[PDB]
Design a protein around this ligand. Structure first.
Ligand SMILES: O=C1NC(=O)[C@@]2(CCN(Cc3ccccc3)C2)N1
Ligand SMILES: [Mg+2]
Ligand code: NA
Ligand code: NA
Lengths: 240, 806, 334, 49
RNA sequence: GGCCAGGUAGCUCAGUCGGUAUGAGCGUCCGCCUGAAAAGCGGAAGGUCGGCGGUUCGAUCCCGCCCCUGGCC
């Protein structure tokens, strides 16, 4: 029974492992992964996503802009411009997932972080409907919250989706918890990428990884997810 | 702000006009609003109180008539004669607050300084306080999305409820509900510049109101429940109609207007004193209302004090205007004025109810203030005058909402729902022509119409149908490599962190880098959370070293961290590109122009080590971190990448010059590794002996080797060779030279001795390699292995100057 | 749905062993001739109850493998006999462990679907075939180099192979002394997941090594992966911002007391304040006494909501000392 | 450039790696992976086929 | 935008309106002690008291600005 581990194993980050598990779930359903730059142009982060000219999210209040002023260059407020680059470079149909670092103006406390990771999905094909979106969200929920996981969509609003909806998740390991948003791809976004809206429909969705990992595992302080303390990562095991 | 507050009684009242006897549980109404697309923030009731809570009249203690001649006695708000509400001795105000006590709007849980003063005639002194104040009501706090500006009132939300409950709706802005006041001539001269974005401007005066009159209790109470404090009947009706119909109204002093009113752009440096008594610096892109003297109001934001309705105004000129949403939103955000009118104008206001809402104020003002409505009206509706405010019609298939939803709705569902929200729907075979109402400018495309049918039918009917899985290719080579690198480092004792892209303040000054160092050329953020950390990360080490200090400063002194993330390396000044039109696809030249304007963002892998590399135990005292541990992390990443790397000495801060290796893949530099400089460690507060690694994964090419080894069945020959080289000769260079000379018989070579001493000479060292020779088709003799050994010795003498140990 | 949890774990176990120095082989299901007689197994040993092939390629190898060790040891002999003396091999495959004599099932008519009872009958007639992971080690575990002459393979290396498979499976295992051939009875551990036995590990018996032509000091490990439940833990760590307290406790126990039993007693007595415990000294000097050993553990105490005093940590240390005195008979060194 | 790998890395078998690559190829297309016993009844090995 | 209240050792926090923070607990170091440790006892190291300036022979403590936090808006 003497200790024999001369080199104590480390640990991959739980967010990275959750991202890898989310990726494998969609790879198993025929999707693929795509990456994009974190410093993104305003053309792909707002303009191509049907954001109006005077949208409040385009100001210096919520979006990290790159100096000097009016440079049209910023840290991405979402991984959606990665899907725009895929819609411009790849041939239809497109079933891709984007898991990357996201930047928001919210301060770092026990339940919010300015630097978080989110997963965004994008499916564009002939005859995609809301039922295909809800079925994808449910398969996403079951793989991350157990077989008894079910999603619920309530009408909402997003500039790049129409109709839009927010996703709530039900997991029997705690009720409904606010998970993320979804909706059918707006026809303006398809026209901004050279796609005929009359021939191709599509849906999209987006959830935060730090948010998903918080209420699932019951992690109280989300500052422990990003500060890089060894006591937080080691209990999650070495990794895959 | 996207906040909308109104009580349930006022909302139920407008709905009950068309659907008599309609009344639902506030819990049910919240589920209905949340189901059709309205986010409910909070459902707060009023009060509640019980027992001794009645209304009294004052006659600074004074006798308060609690009713039936039972006077009891008990701050700058009320005087003598004003009806007030008191919690008689033995109070039970929310929550548990137990002479008398003259309550306020905040103490009773009803509104926001002074005490509550009921208007004269609101209630006989002695009536039930909970009944007069209406504490049984429930206030709904809603967060209205920007696409539904028509829901910024009771009119829009009552319409939404009538749609969800399939009710008959009576528009409170209709001419059958608002009798059209006579039009016997102009109300006031008006000039307007058509390039300012005004769509409609209506004016109607009210003459001879009582200055001492106050608004009735039902009007003031509904204002407080919506978050607006009552002032005077002239202003209370302007805010009450705004909350009712959605068209914001502003009252001016008719006698305090000199000359012709004029809607006009502002001037640079022009400052207008608003109603709050504050100077507001204006811009050339702002809309104003001016006359022959000063400025009357800021277009769609807030009125000025020049025409402000005082507490003695008798002649009031009411204003009903429709301003440009972009001009109002651009103006109210510059000077920080999120007024109730500006929030609704930026979300567009129904331009067809301007006169209807105008006549709503005049009749309501003259009724509660004893005024006389003048039969004059000035209604400017553009040039030429616009008499139809309907948006362009939309065409879409009758089954388009069925296809987008994946649900076979009953026939007539799309046409019924679209007419239910106020749109004109005509039939032409299988194509519907839908003209949205004037209060729905968000409906422009068929997708907008699909949302209306889907949200009203409920998104719960949409089934869960997994789409067919396309023939995907899976993870790319680089994505598989990042996983393998993470697995291999974690299994070797490294703990992954999430690095932050914001560099510490003066991190490169602590590293002692030169002024022209490429890593100093960073990308600055205009609005960072910390003003002293605006620069983006050109290297993952500062984020790792920051996390290394955090673990060491908290009792974890034996740390090994790593991170896999991109960096931001600009090649020029921050340069943006012009706006590409969104109505088309950007060409490949414009896409490459967008990529070139962005800084180079390659994905790096980096790692830091400190303290004990191997922990102590029953085997020994452990081994501290040294530079070779950093070099081994390079080999671990290399084996995970299935590429061969070479290490060469290099001088590269912040690494120790004599303990730094530059990693190469073939002939391309991919990063550095080793121990950090002791000066950098001292200035940064790092623990002594800290080692670091950083590689550029984009510079490492993805390999797919296909080995075909042939296991020889013949015995091997074991030989050792000792070679003396100069001290600066890398042991790998000797091994490569021995391998190149030994030939194909050399199956394996391993270094197992590095000896220095006087037997060898100054600045020289002896290296002993273990060699294993094996033939693929025969058994070797000792001379055959010695011949390949002698060739390896001669190859070492010619490449690294090795001398056979004697 | 992608890979199952078992398929995913089998990859992780293979990656971890390969990255730890082990070389994967493909084990042959046919057992060597008289290998159990070389191991000295009893006549009623369950591993002897094998499934035999009627027409094998080699008539002296008809039986199917009840354990993965014979194929690994045969591959171990091949490597060593050809100049590769420092080798660590592993394999992940199934075994054939019948529970009765070879009993067949009659022909089911293929013109219809077999009923669920007939499908269950066909499964019951087949021998049990669980997934096994096993490894063998010989020669130098750590090679020689500029650091030193290397370290030969010892039983602890086989014990560490268990913890590598355990960490890769995200399960907690315990090792207990056991007498189970072909292992050395004094250097053999039985691996448990909770209270279920999943295999053994350690150094092979010296007599088995002589009779089998194996290298001296050969170590081996074999675990039943089916007996290890697939776990999906959801940790929720609470990183305390308050400083820790470092103390060391030296306890004297009998030589037969396992070091993990002392550590388990110290944790049980220390309470929630104990953040970490690690053994770093095993002293058997003459001032300790015959058949007695001294164990020194490094303790790290940390409170989640306050800063501890030295007395607070000492109170937890003393409670840990009493727990060791009660469960393993430890005596405080002095 | 001194040797620093004190733990000689091993290797997963190429056949196992090829099977893993083949499995990932079909899983990326929606397929799943099933397993079975090597000792099989003649009903499932011949008669059912 | 308002007065305030806070930033102090490696960690968590006390305390002074001007010359010593005789700072605490834990963390670090030395000695006695032990085969080596820890505890215990006995000694120590370590802060430029939020930054840039202003007054003063002298500023953690007073003026001004700002950096960042809560509070209450
Ligand atoms: O706060 C937030 N974090 C997020 O990820 C989001 C949730 C999802 N939203 C993105 C999205 C909206 C509609 C369709 C596809 C993606 C952003 N909101
Ligand atoms: Mg819409
Ligand atoms: Na070295
Ligand atoms: Na020389």
């Amino acid at each position: 029974t003497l200790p024999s581990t001369r080199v104590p194993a480390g640990a991959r980050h739980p967010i990275i492992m959750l991202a890898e598990h989310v990726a494998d779930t969609f790879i198993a359903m025929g999707w693929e992964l795509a990456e994009g730059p974190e410093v993104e142009t305003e053309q792909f982060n707002f303009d191509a996503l049907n954001f109006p000219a005077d949208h409040p999210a385009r100001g210096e209040q919520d979006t990290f802009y790159i100096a000097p002023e009016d440079s049209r260059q910023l840290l991405r407020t979402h991984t959606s411009p990665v899907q725009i680059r895929t819609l411009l470079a790849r041939e239809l149909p497109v079933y891709i997932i984007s898991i990357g670092r996201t930047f928001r103006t919210d301060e770092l406390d026990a339940t919010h972080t300015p630097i978080f990771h989110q997963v965004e999905g994008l499916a564009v094909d002939r005859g995609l409907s809301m039922a295909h979106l809800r079925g994808t969200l449910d398969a996403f929920a079951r793989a991350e919250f157990g077989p008894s996981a079910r999603t619920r969509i309530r009408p909402h609003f997003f500039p790049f989706t129409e109709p839009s909806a927010e996703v709530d998740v039900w997991f029997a390991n705690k009720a409904w918890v606010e998970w993320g948003g979804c909706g059918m791809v707006h026809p303006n976004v398809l026209r901004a990428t050279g796609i005929d809206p009359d021939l191709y429909s599509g849906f999209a969705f987006g959830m935060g990884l730090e948010r998903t990992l918080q209420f699932r595992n019951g992690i109280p302080d989300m500052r422990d997810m990003v500060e890089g303390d060894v006591r937080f990562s080691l209990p999650f095991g070495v990794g895959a | 702000s996207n906040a909308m507050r109104l009580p349930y009684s006022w909302l139920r009242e407008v709905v009950a006009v068309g659907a008599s006897g309609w009344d639902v549980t506030p819990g049910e109404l919240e589920q209905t609003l949340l189901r059709i697309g309205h986010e409910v923030e909070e459902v707060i009731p009023l009060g509640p109180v019980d027992g001794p809570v009645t209304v009294g009249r004052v006659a600074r203690a004074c006798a308060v008539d609690i009713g039936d001649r039972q006077y009891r006695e008990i701050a700058t708000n009320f005087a003598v004669g004003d009806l007030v509400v008191v919690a008689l001795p033995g109070a039970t105000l929310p929550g548990g607050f137990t002479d008398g006590m003259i309550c306020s709007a905040a103490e009773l849980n009803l509104g926001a300084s002074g005490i509550l003063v009921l208007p004269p005639g609101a209630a006989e002194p002695g009536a039930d306080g909970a009944g007069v104040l209406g504490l049984d009501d429930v206030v709904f706090h809603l967060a209205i999305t920007p696409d539904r500006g028509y829901c910024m009132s009771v009119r829009g939300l009552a319409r939404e409820l009538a749609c969800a409950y399939d009710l008959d709706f009576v528009d409170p802005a209709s001419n059958s509900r608002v009798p059209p006041l006579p039009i016997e001539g102009p109300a006031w001269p008006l000039t307007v510049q058509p390039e300012t974005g005004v769509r409609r401007f209506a004016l109607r005066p009210v003459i001879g109101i009582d200055p001492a009159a106050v608004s009735p209790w039902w009007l003031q109470r509904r204002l407080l429940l919506c978050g607006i404090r009552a002032t005077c009947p002239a202003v209370d009706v302007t805010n009450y109609v705004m909350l009712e119909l959605g068209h914001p109204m502003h009252a001016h002093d008719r006698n305090r207007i000199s000359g012709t009113l004029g809607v006009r752009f502002a001037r640079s440096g022009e400052t207008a004193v608003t109603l709050d008594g504050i100077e507001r610096k204006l811009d050339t892109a702002d809309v104003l209302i001016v006359d022959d003297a000063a400025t009357a109001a800021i277009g769609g934001v807030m009125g000025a004090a020049s025409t402000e309705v005082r507490a003695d105004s008798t002649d009031v000129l009411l204003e009903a205007a429709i301003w440009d949403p972009a001009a109002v939103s651009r103006t109210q955000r510059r000077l920080h004025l999120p007024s109730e009118a500006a929030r609704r104008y930026e979300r567009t206001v129904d331009p067809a109810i301007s006169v209807a809402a105008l006549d709503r104020c005049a009749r309501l003002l003259a009724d509660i203030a004893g005024g006389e409505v003048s039969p004059t009206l000035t209604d400017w509706r553009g040039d030429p005058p616009c008499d139809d405010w309907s948006p362009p019609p939309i065409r879409m298939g009758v089954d388009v909402p069925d296809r987008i939803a994946g649900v076979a709705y009953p026939q007539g569902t799309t046409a019924r729902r679209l007419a239910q929200i106020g749109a004109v729907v005509t039939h032409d075979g299988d194509t519907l022509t839908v003209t949205p109402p004037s209060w729905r400018p968000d409906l422009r495309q068929p997708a907008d119409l699909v949302e209306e049918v889907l949200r009203l039918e409920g998104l719960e009917v949409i089934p869960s149908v997994l789409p067919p899985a396309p023939a995907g290719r899976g993870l790319t080579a680089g994505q598989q490599r990042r996983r393998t690198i993470g697995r291999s480092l974690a299994l070797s004792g490294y703990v992954e962190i999430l690095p932050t892209p914001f560099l510490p303040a003066g991190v490169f000054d602590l590293w002692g880098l030169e002024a022209d160092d490429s890593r100093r050329m960073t990308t600055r953020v205009l609005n960072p959370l910390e003003a002293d950390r605006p620069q983006l990360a050109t290297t993952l080490l500062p984020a790792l070293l920051e996390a290394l200090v955090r673990n060491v400063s908290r009792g974890l002194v034996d740390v090994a961290l790593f991170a896999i993330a991109q960096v931001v390396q600009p090649t020029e000044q921050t340069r943006g590109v012009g706006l590409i039109p969104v109505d088309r696809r950007p060409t490949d030249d414009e896409i490459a122009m967008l990529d070139a304007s962005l800084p180079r963002q390659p994905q790096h892998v980096a790692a830091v080590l400190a303290g004990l590399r191997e922990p102590r135990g029953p085997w020994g005292p452990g081994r501290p971190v040294e530079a070779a541990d950093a070099f081994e992390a390079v080999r671990i990443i290399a084996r995970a990448s299935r590429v061969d790397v070479t290490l060469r000495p290099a001088q590269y801060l912040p690494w120790h010059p004599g303990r730094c290796a530059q990693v190469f893949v073939g002939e391309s530099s991919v990063g550095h590794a080793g121990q950090l400089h002791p000066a950098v460690i001292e200035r940064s507060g790092l623990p002594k002996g800290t080692c670091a690694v950083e590689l550029n994964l984009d510079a490492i090419p993805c390999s797919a080797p296909l080995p075909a080894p042939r296991v020889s069945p013949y015995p091997a020959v074991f030989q050792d060779v000792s070679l003396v080289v100069a001290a600066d000769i890398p042991a790998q260079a000797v091994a490569d030279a021995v391998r190149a000379g030994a030939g194909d018989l050399l199956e394996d070579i391993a270094l197992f001795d590095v000896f220095t001493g006087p037997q060898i000479g100054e600045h020289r060292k002896s290296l002993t390699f273990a060699l294993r020779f094996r033939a693929p088709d025969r058994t070797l003799t000792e001379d055959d292995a010695s011949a390949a050994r002698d060739a390896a010795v001669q190859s070492a003498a010619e490449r690294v100057g090795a001398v056979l140990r004697g």
